[PDB]
Design a protein around this motif. Structure first.
Motif, PDB file in Angstrom:
ATOM      1  N   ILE A 174       9.153  -7.647  -7.128  1.00 26.88           N
ATOM      2  CA  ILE A 174       8.248  -8.256  -5.818  1.00 26.88           C
ATOM      3  C   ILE A 174       9.675  -8.387  -5.496  1.00 26.88           C
ATOM      4  CG2 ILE A 174       7.569  -9.837  -3.543  1.00 26.88           C
ATOM      5  CD1 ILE A 174       5.054  -8.545  -5.355  1.00 26.88           C
ATOM      6  N   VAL A 175      10.716  -7.480  -4.290  1.00 30.14           N
ATOM      7  CA  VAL A 175      11.817  -7.625  -3.245  1.00 30.14           C
ATOM      8  C   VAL A 175      11.565  -8.215  -2.186  1.00 30.14           C
ATOM      9  CG1 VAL A 175      12.788  -5.982  -4.637  1.00 30.14           C
ATOM     10  CG2 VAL A 175      11.500  -5.447  -2.349  1.00 30.14           C
ATOM     11  N   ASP A 176      12.857  -8.649  -1.821  1.00 30.93           N
ATOM     12  CA  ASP A 176      13.352  -9.382  -0.494  1.00 30.93           C
ATOM     13  C   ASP A 176      13.421  -8.458   0.856  1.00 30.93           C
ATOM     14  OD1 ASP A 176      15.894  -9.424  -0.640  1.00 30.93           O
ATOM     15  OD2 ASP A 176      16.160 -12.035  -0.979  1.00 30.93           O
ATOM     16  N   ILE A 177      13.822  -8.797   2.290  1.00 29.21           N
ATOM     17  CA  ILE A 177      14.151  -8.311   3.085  1.00 29.21           C
ATOM     18  C   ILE A 177      15.625  -7.832   2.926  1.00 29.21           C
ATOM     19  CG2 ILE A 177      15.156  -9.933   4.471  1.00 29.21           C
ATOM     20  CD1 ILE A 177      13.177  -7.214   5.641  1.00 29.21           C
ATOM     21  N   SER A 201       0.943  -8.139  -8.462  1.00 27.82           N
ATOM     22  CA  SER A 201      -0.532  -8.211  -8.633  1.00 27.82           C
ATOM     23  C   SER A 201      -0.197  -9.219  -9.709  1.00 27.82           C
ATOM     24  CB  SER A 201      -0.529  -7.150  -9.265  1.00 27.82           C
ATOM     25  OG  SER A 201      -1.353  -5.619  -8.084  1.00 27.82           O
ATOM     26  N   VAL A 202       0.618 -10.468 -10.063  1.00 25.00           N
ATOM     27  CA  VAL A 202       0.538 -11.327 -10.677  1.00 25.00           C
ATOM     28  C   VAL A 202      -0.113 -12.454 -10.738  1.00 25.00           C
ATOM     29  CG1 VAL A 202       1.683 -12.357 -12.096  1.00 25.00           C
ATOM     30  CG2 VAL A 202       2.143 -10.476 -11.812  1.00 25.00           C
ATOM     31  N   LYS A 215       2.063  -4.668  -3.365  1.00 28.39           N
ATOM     32  CA  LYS A 215       3.385  -3.893  -2.044  1.00 28.39           C
ATOM     33  C   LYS A 215       2.115  -3.369  -1.437  1.00 28.39           C
ATOM     34  CE  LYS A 215       6.681  -1.967  -1.298  1.00 28.39           C
ATOM     35  NZ  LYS A 215       6.785  -2.309   0.592  1.00 28.39           N
ATOM     36  N   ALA A 216       2.717  -3.045   0.608  1.00 30.69           N
ATOM     37  CA  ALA A 216       1.932  -2.407   1.130  1.00 30.69           C
ATOM     38  C   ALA A 216       2.557  -1.624   2.287  1.00 30.69           C
ATOM     39  CB  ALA A 216       1.707  -3.794   2.352  1.00 30.69           C
ATOM     40  N   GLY A 217       2.129  -1.001   2.449  1.00 32.22           N
ATOM     41  CA  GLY A 217       2.683   0.285   3.436  1.00 32.22           C
ATOM     42  C   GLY A 217       4.228   0.613   4.321  1.00 32.22           C
ATOM     43  N   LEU A 218       4.622  -0.544   4.130  1.00 29.76           N
ATOM     44  CA  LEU A 218       6.291  -0.469   5.255  1.00 29.76           C
ATOM     45  C   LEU A 218       7.137  -0.683   4.800  1.00 29.76           C
ATOM     46  CD1 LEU A 218       4.559  -3.192   8.033  1.00 29.76           C
ATOM     47  CD2 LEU A 218       3.962   0.042   7.508  1.00 29.76           C
ATOM     48  N   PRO A 219       8.129  -0.615   5.535  1.00 29.62           N
ATOM     49  CA  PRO A 219       9.173  -0.830   4.372  1.00 29.62           C
ATOM     50  C   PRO A 219       9.396  -2.841   3.991  1.00 29.62           C
ATOM     51  CG  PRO A 219       9.835   0.442   6.215  1.00 29.62           C
ATOM     52  CD  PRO A 219       8.534  -0.022   6.229  1.00 29.62           C
ATOM     53  N   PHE A 220       9.549  -3.133   2.576  1.00 30.66           N
ATOM     54  CA  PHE A 220      10.309  -4.343   1.854  1.00 30.66           C
ATOM     55  C   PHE A 220       8.742  -5.100   2.401  1.00 30.66           C
ATOM     56  CE2 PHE A 220      14.654  -2.239   3.188  1.00 30.66           C
ATOM     57  CZ  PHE A 220      14.955  -2.607   1.878  1.00 30.66           C
ATOM     58  N   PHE A 276      -0.817 -10.450   0.851  1.00 28.96           N
ATOM     59  CA  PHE A 276      -0.942 -11.429  -0.373  1.00 28.96           C
ATOM     60  C   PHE A 276      -3.063 -10.945  -0.803  1.00 28.96           C
ATOM     61  CE2 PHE A 276       2.440 -14.360   1.374  1.00 28.96           C
ATOM     62  CZ  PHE A 276       2.613 -14.323   0.919  1.00 28.96           C
ATOM     63  N   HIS A 277      -3.354 -10.833  -1.632  1.00 27.74           N
ATOM     64  CA  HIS A 277      -4.811 -10.215  -2.277  1.00 27.74           C
ATOM     65  C   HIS A 277      -4.994 -12.302  -3.360  1.00 27.74           C
ATOM     66  CE1 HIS A 277      -7.403  -7.746  -3.594  1.00 27.74           C
ATOM     67  NE2 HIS A 277      -7.539  -8.147  -4.756  1.00 27.74           N
ATOM     68  N   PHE A 278      -6.376 -11.709  -2.937  1.00 33.26           N
ATOM     69  CA  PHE A 278      -7.420 -13.117  -4.079  1.00 33.26           C
ATOM     70  C   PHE A 278      -7.967 -12.516  -5.133  1.00 33.26           C
ATOM     71  CE2 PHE A 278     -10.384 -15.044  -4.741  1.00 33.26           C
ATOM     72  CZ  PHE A 278      -9.391 -16.985  -5.116  1.00 33.26           C
TER      73      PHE A 278
END
Ligand SMILES: *[C@@H]1O[C@H](CO)[C@@H](O[C@@H]2O[C@H](CO)[C@@H](O)[C@H](O)[C@H]2NC(C)=O)[C@H](O[C@@H]2O[C@@H](C)[C@@H](O)[C@@H](O)[C@@H]2O)[C@H]1NC(C)=O
Ligand SMILES: *[C@@H]1O[C@H](CO)[C@@H](O[C@@H]2O[C@H](CO)[C@@H](O)[C@H](O)[C@H]2NC(C)=O)[C@H](O[C@@H]2O[C@@H](C)[C@@H](O)[C@@H](O)[C@@H]2O)[C@H]1NC(C)=O
Ligand SMILES: [Co+2]
Ligand SMILES: [Co+2]
Ligand SMILES: [N+]
Ligand SMILES: [N+]
Ligand SMILES: [N+]
Lengths: 182, 183
Positions: free
Chosen positions: A5-8, A75-76, A129-134, A138-140
């Motif tokens: 995962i990366v930050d802005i 996804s961890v 990951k979602a469909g927008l930059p950076f 969250f998923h349960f």
């Protein structure tokens, strides 16, 4: 291995470090995350809400297993908490649970840390990951042994009867970016 | 002063430097920009289209006034071109014009640079902040005198009958990010 995962700023998101978790979409849907009670006279207990006015409160991610590079990956299962003090008798950690006034499964406080059996997985979240930059959601859907009480789902915003922006499990996902606090 | 436009790495966007101009939204909406003809047997003339498969072709912004620090800023008229070679007898500069087979005003090639003649303003575009991280839209509304022919509007994508993704003037705006091609 799963991707970091990366930050802005495009740098790896790390465990044990404060981030604001902020809506990727501006305007009406803008804002970071904080905590609020039921919304009527009672101040407690708390759930995780979106603050429409600012980047919200600092959040820290904690690893379930030993993660030597300290990097949060896609996804961890991981734990999530606010790094703040509150005046309710519960931890500042997230979990999925029932919350008064809200049908379904809500992201509340009072979460646990680590794996110690079925119920502890209710404090485990995945970042995908979602469909927008950076941007991420969250998923349960924990990968550790648990009961089928809480169905897997994304996390999204739900306006309750006080128009407080609750986070709940539902089909659609809210997109966020991670902004290092310091 | 207006704020700099920044690229996907948060650095100011500069005039005279190649960038890919790429959809902020992934999946069906993803892809950068390139050029294509009217879609039937004719190769010419060309309009600006989204390539769904990759970041597209390199684009260069050119200043209308002298800009000493060379930084592209929000809501300032500028010129746009592809830094490629084409096999149509026109420039690779963008402009708003009528294009064969497309209803409304289209972003085509054959643009002019600078400000000579009122027509040259049809080659002037503004870059404005959009509501997504590092994301921007193109807006047509020149700040220089011109005829009343072309209304101000945003630039968005329109699927034509061949499912070619045309850029047209319309109410809604396509959000893009800028990626330095030497990155
Ligand atoms: C979690 O929140 C804490 C309470 O705000 C942060 O500790 C506080 O950081 C302040 C500077 O922002 C400093 O005045 C206080 O001395 C300190 N309070 C305590 C009780 O330690 C903490 O910030 C991190 O930890 C401290 C030691 C400094 O190194 C900060 O720069 C760090 O950000 C927040 N984060 C963590 C991971 O604990
Ligand atoms: C515009 O496109 C030109 C043609 O692709 C670029 O010049 C070409 O850059 C190549 C390296 O990518 C180099 O092999 C070729 O020699 C060169 N072709 C010509 C005719 O110069 C140009 O790239 C910039 O300028 C060149 C000289 C190098 O310094 C590149 O690093 C630059 O990006 C493209 N951009 C501009 C602003 O002209
Ligand atoms: Co292509
Ligand atoms: Co003259
Ligand atoms: N409250
Ligand atoms: N073509
Ligand atoms: N003109």
């Amino acid at each position: 291995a799963p991707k970091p995962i990366v930050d802005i700023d495009g740098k790896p998101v790390l465990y044990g470090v404060d981030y604001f978790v902020v809506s990727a979409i501006w305007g009406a849907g803008g804002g970071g995350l904080t905590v609020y009670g039921p919304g009527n006279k009672k101040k407690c207990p708390l759930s995780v809400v979106q603050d429409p006015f600012d980047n919200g409160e600092p959040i820290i991610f904690s690893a379930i297993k030993n993660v030597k590079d300290n990097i949060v990956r896609e996804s961890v299962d991981l734990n999530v908490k606010f790094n703040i003090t509150i005046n309710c008798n519960e931890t500042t950690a997230w979990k999925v649970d029932r919350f008064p006034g809200v049908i379904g499964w809500t992201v509340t406080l009072g979460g646990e840390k680590g794996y110690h059996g079925f119920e502890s997985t209710h404090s485990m979240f995945k970042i995908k990951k979602a469909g927008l930059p950076f941007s991420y959601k969250f998923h349960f859907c924990p990968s550790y042994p648990r009961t089928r009480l809480i169905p897997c789902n994304n996390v999204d915003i739900f306006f309750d009867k006080y128009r407080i922006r609750r986070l709940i499990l539902t089909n659609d996902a809210k997109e966020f970016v991670f902004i290092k606090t310091n």
